Design a protein around this ligand. Structure first.
Ligand SMILES: [Zn+2]
Lengths: 1126, 49, 98
């Protein structure tokens, strides 16, 4: 195909390998290995073919292939030498595009269902046909639906809302099985890349995986409840109550599920025993806020079934968004003050519908996001450049100034030149001032370099310095000195005046001498190599060391630089009322400009001659005429060339130019208008003119700590990371636009700017970056909060899950876990680009955020922004506390198990054993086996022993205490021995675990039951890496009198773990045999307690299943449909 | 019984920080990086850049 | 090879590239120092027998001694005016104490 052929043609025309390397030049490694006339070396193809051609005599010059190829190589060498195409790119690179426009997050998401997270599931069906009680008792026979499912045994499990008519899904769920089914696939998710058993999981990552599950459980409860209408009741179950009708095709079961106090109470079943013990005026709607006659009601408060945990979480998220809320009046004020007059917008003045637009954030969040952007943009030349090109092409469409280099030719055609004399000072200018690729963009790139100096430093490229020379006698070098002396103050490098002076010190060498500081940076050194405040000459800093008798020209040029160089100023853009300013190391609401700015007073601009740039051009022309008037410096220039040069220079001083006036009094207003509508905000270290003091010699960022130390103000000076890049420009392209600028012939500035500026503020993209800032700051704070749980960090974190065992975390574990947190937050919130990723390149454990620059003398200013609050980390810590008190609902049990043969006809549940079967470390006559425990064999009928902690030998009897890791590390040996001895003998082992998931196996109490086939499989499947779930054999509670059967149980618990039970034998009148439990009265505080106010949660201890919840109808339109105007 | 090493050793734990200047080789890398930073700082040695 | 098969320490070179990514290369007249150290470290190689034999020679100080090759030194003495010899000195001064 064609693109291969055209690409080969490009590679043929552009690449002869002249490519530049950085090395000392050696006599071996030269491109001219053997030049084929005389066998020398010249290190470059252009000089090599010049060597081949120069030995041929110049009357015998015939065009041939090599003669063409020399011009080809010279052409491509100068084209690659040009700096704008040295640093350029056509396409994006996933970093510049991410900086230029980032993905917005999806904050507002609305739930139309009901807020819950804890469902109720039946397990075993209740015996509805039975002989002792006729079937006409039960409400199941009449198909009366109930809020609670009828069953013999019912438990509550955890589901992500199971009812939510959701607007937008967040793909992160904690869908859980009932505890009869297996449940270890949730707890083997995180760091189990090694557990080959499907049914197994490593106990050393339980804490990490459980709190990652808590993170996903919080992130799936980030919604707002939405108002979904009501309907006045017509059946007399609840008099006058207003019931919410949630949308969907099926709406039958929902009223009975939502309103447990609505049903009738016909019998003495346990459900009706609960419902007859309820209050009745606490159903449905009880509050609303009507603001308009027959519009959508603003917010209502309803009694319904709910979950107080997720009610609290959605309340915190709503408090966050209500803190972000703004109003169109402040939007109008911020946009008008931002645009400084010219464009007006309108906001309507009427009673509203109480809308919601989350956009206001804080200065701390803005500064933290700016630190993350500068950490992104660190040391890359090809990332900062397209932002400057964007600002350049945007400034070209707002600037009324145009560039007409026919002005310089039309004012050139008045100078008188004799046809006789060989030097034409007029035509040298017109041959020289045409720039290299004829681009004029270097001017606007220099203005964008005024906007940004902390990350990019615009210097003037080597290719404009006047060709490894000097020679004040040479007219071309004189014009190059004038061009460079005009072009240098517009760039933003802090070492511009020393380059300006040492250009002239390079220009005259041998005419006038001047002392230097060593023999490295002598007078004959190229001026562009200095570029550092350590290289500034002492003779330049001290004017006394230049003698007026030897160097009067250099002394007065130094005085002109020291006194007449342009001064820095400021413009005061923006507003921090809305979108608080991201300025750092500068105060907010200020910009810095390297030239002076007074503002204009009229709107019809004309030409006058009073500003510092025309003053600078006048002083440069004045010194160059003092230089050319001297006859000893150019003795070959007789009379008419001297007078013609004087007149050309005076005329060039008095050209009618408009670019200095434009830079003096129109372009700072444009920069102040542009700069808040900009995706990368300004980032400025202070400008300073001539001194070897206060010059920014570095600027650096940090992302981690150093040692045992904790304070960022101490760690920053050794954990900084230097950010910055130089950038090259074109001196001729700056100078011709400086000399040849014109306004339109009839322009009025307010009409022109009110025309040009309005399409910018028509676009409203800038409000969609502050939500990305919200999510960035929430991400970094929840990262440090979560890593602080499993590892040791510096922040005063609260610890809740210390009782669950976990791995001794290393930096690889922490980095992997932080990657999991990043992936979870990216798959929520609807964004796919680089978030939290610059922090992952270092250690995630010891992170911090700070920034500093350093002056020349040693002063370091720092900005350590305070870390603001974070509702996501708040809700995760709340979920951790309430999981500590309610651990049983997520499948976790606490404590440890005791493996021992228990044979009885009793019906006690193994999740609540009677307290004499258990034993502790403090129980007398109990052995502990933490240490070596070498089992010695028996012989000649004597029993075998095992070695105590205290160094004793004990037979295989009694009560033992193992750590789990001991059995885990010596599984098969201990399996053979102790699985022989447990099943019939009198041995009992307590295996200390802390945390473990489990399964439940129900059985008929009327028949025989033995659990060896369940426990022995678990004991065999305990591996050195993983363990499988712990099987419990729990009976089934009955409604009536039953018989008894011997049941043989082996694994028992230690403390109460039967919290997930919920109303066994519900439709029955009572429970006779087995574990009994009524409705938990503590869960329904509002029904059962007439003293309890409506808004009450006992949230840390228990979780209520029924509370007041608010529901909203706040509409969210875009800004352009509310605030508009022209 | 001893085995001579050309490097210092400490008791082993996996939960020790990555940036620890108690460590000899981390200290060595830090000092070499700081000296080459001091070398490239002033630009005294490199004209022609 | 026994140390390589027993050792927990896995070595991959992608940490260096992820720290100093610097994707662009189209500047064919200058040369960035990050590109210099990537092209000099050469992360595309996957050989570390020099590291494992450097670990093994501590047991046999008394018969063999490990030195750094001549080609790892700067060419023709080197000088500080060259970025390549600066990076050569950095790599050498890190590699010497083993
Ligand atoms: Zn030759």
């Amino acid at each position: 195909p064609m693109s291969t052929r055209i690409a080969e043609a490009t590679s043929a025309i552009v690449s002869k390998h002249p490519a530049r390397v950085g090395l000392p030049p050696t006599a071996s490694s030269g491109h001219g290995y053997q030049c084929h006339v005389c066998s020398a070396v010249l290190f470059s193809p252009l000089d090599l073919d010049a060597h081949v051609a120069s030995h041929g005599l110049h009357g015998n010059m015939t065009l041939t292939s090599s003669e063409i190829q020399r011009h080809i190589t010279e052409f491509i060498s100068s084209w690659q030498n040009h700096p704008i195409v040295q640093v350029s790119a056509d396409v994006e690179n996933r970093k510049t595009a991410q900086l230029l426009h980032a993905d917005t997050p999806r904050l507002v998401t609305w739930d139309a269902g009901l807020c819950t997270s804890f469902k109720i599931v039946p397990i075993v069906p209740a015996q509805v046909p039975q002989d002792v009680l006729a079937y006409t008792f039960f409400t199941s026979s009449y198909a009366i639906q109930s809020p609670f499912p009828e069953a013999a045994v019912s438990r509550i499990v955890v589901h992500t809302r199971w009812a939510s008519n959701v607007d937008f899904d967040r793909d992160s769920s904690v869908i859980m099985a009932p505890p009869t089914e297996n449940n270890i696939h949730l707890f083997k998710q995180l760091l189990n890349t090694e557990t080959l058993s499907v049914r197994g999981a490593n106990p050393l990552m339980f804490r990490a995986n459980v709190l990652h599950m808590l993170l996903e459980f919080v992130l799936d409860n980030l919604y707002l409840n939405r108002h979904t209408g009501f309907s006045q009741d017509h059946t007399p179950f609840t008099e006058g109550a207003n019931l919410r009708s949630l949308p969907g095709p099926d709406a039958e079961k929902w009223y009975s599920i939502m309103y447990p106090t609505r049903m009738g109470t016909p019998n003495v079943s346990k459900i009706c025993n609960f419902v007859a013990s309820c209050v009745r005026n606490r159903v449905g709607r009880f509050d609303r806020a009507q603001m308009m006659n027959g519009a959508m009601s603003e917010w209502v408060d309803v009694f319904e079934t709910s979950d107080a945990l997720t009610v609290s979480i959605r309340g915190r998220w709503m408090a966050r968004l209500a803190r972000m809320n703004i109003n169109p009046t402040e939007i109008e004020w911020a946009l008008t003050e931002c645009a400084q007059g010219y464009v007006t917008v309108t906001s309507p003045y009427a009673p509203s519908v109480n809308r919601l637009m989350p956009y206001r954030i804080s200065n701390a969040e803005r500064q933290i996001s700016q630190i993350i952007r500068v950490m992104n943009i660190g040391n890359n030349a090809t990332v900062i450049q397209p932002v400057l090109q964007d600002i350049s092409v945007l400034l070209q469409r707002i600037s009324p100034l145009q560039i007409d280099p026919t002005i310089i030719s039309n004012t050139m055609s008045t100078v008188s030149e004799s046809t006789t004399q060989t030097l034409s000072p007029a035509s040298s200018i017109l041959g020289k001032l045409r720039p290299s690729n004829s681009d004029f963009s270097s001017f606007r790139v220099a203005l964008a370099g005024w906007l940004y100096n902390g990350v990019v430093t615009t210097v003037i490229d080597d290719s404009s310095y006047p060709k490894d020379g000097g020679s004040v006698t040479s007219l071309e070098n004189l014009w190059d000195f004038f061009i460079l002396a005009l072009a240098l103050p517009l760039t933003t490098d802090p070492c511009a005046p020393v380059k300006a002076f040492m250009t002239l010190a390079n220009m005259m060498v041998g005419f006038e001498t001047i002392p230097m500081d060593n023999q490295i940076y002598t007078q004959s050194r190229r001026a562009s190599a200095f570029s550092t405040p350590h290289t500034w000459p002492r003779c330049f800093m001290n004017i006394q060391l230049i003698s007026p008798i030897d160097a009067p020209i250099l002394r007065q040029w130094a005085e002109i630089i020291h006194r007449y160089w342009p001064n820095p100023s400021q413009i005061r853009y923006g507003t921090p009322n809305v979108f608080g300013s991201a300025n750092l190391f500068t105060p907010p609401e200020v910009l810095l400009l390297p030239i002076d700015h007074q503002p204009a007073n009229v709107t019809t601009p004309t030409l006058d001659f009073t500003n510092e740039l025309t003053n600078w051009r006048a002083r440069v022309c004045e010194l160059m005429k003092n230089l050319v008037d001297n006859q000893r410096y150019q003795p070959g220039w007789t009379q008419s060339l001297v007078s013609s040069m004087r007149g050309t220079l005076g005329k060039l001083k008095l050209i009618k130019s408009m670019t200095p006036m434009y830079l003096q009094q129109l372009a700072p207003v444009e920069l102040a208008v542009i700069a808040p509508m900009l995706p990368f905000p300004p980032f400025q270290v202070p400008y300073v003119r001539l001194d070897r003091d206060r010059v920014p010699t570095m600027v650096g960022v940090t992302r981690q700590s150093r040692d045992t130390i904790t304070q960022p103000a101490l760690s920053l000076s050794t954990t900084n990371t230097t950010v910055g890049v130089p950038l090259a420009l074109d001196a001729r392209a700056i100078t011709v636009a400086l000399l040849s600028g014109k306004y339109p012939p009839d322009l009025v500035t307010n009409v022109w700017y009110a025309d040009a500026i309005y399409p910018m503020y028509a676009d409203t993209e800038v409000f969609s970056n502050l939500q990305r800032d919200v999510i960035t700051c929430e991400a970094v704070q929840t990262l440090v909060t979560l890593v602080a749980q499993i590892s040791e960090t510096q922040y005063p974190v609260d610890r809740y899950l210390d009782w669950i065992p976990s791995l001794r975390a290393s930096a690889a574990t922490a980095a992997t876990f932080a990657e999991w947190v990043n992936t979870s937050m990216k798959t929520a919130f609807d964004l796919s680009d680089m978030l939290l990723e610059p922090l992952l390149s270092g250690d995630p454990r010891m992170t911090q955020l700070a920034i500093q620059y350093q002056q020349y003398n040693g002063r370091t200013f720092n900005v350590i922004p305070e870390m603001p609050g974070s509702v996501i980390a708040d809700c995760v810590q709340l979920t951790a506390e309430v999981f500590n008190h309610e651990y049983n609902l997520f499948g976790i049990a606490r404590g440890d198990i005791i493996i021992g043969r228990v044979q009885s006809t009793h019906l006690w549940s193994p999740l609540a054993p009677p307290p004499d079967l258990v034993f502790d470390r403090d129980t007398p006559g109990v052995h502990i086996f933490g240490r070596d425990c070498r089992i010695s064999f028996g012989m000649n009928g004597a029993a075998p022993m095992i070695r105590d902690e205290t160094g004793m030998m004990v037979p295989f009897e009694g009560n033992w205490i193992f750590p789990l890791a001991l059995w885990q590390m010596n599984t098969r040996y201990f399996n053979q021995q102790f699985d022989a001895w447990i099943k019939t003998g009198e041995l009992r082992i307590r295996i200390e675990m802390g945390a473990y998931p489990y399964m439940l196996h129900y059985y008929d109490p009327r028949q025989y039951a033995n659990a060896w086939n369940l426990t022995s499989a678990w004991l065999e499947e305990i591996t050195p890496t993983s363990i499988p779930s712990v099987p419990f054999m729990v009976p089934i509670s009955s409604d009536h009198d039953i018989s008894s059967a011997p049941a043989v149980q082996y694994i028992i618990s230690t403390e109460y773990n039967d919290r997930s039970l919920f109303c066994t034998n519900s439709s029955s009148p009572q429970t006779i045999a087995g574990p009994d439990k009524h409705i938990p009265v503590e869960r329904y505080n509002i029904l059962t307690n007439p003293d309890a106010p409506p808004t009450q949660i006992q949230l840390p201890e228990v979780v209520d299943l029924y509370n007041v919840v608010t529901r909203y109808a706040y509409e969210t339109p875009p800004i352009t449909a509310v605030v508009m105007g022209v």
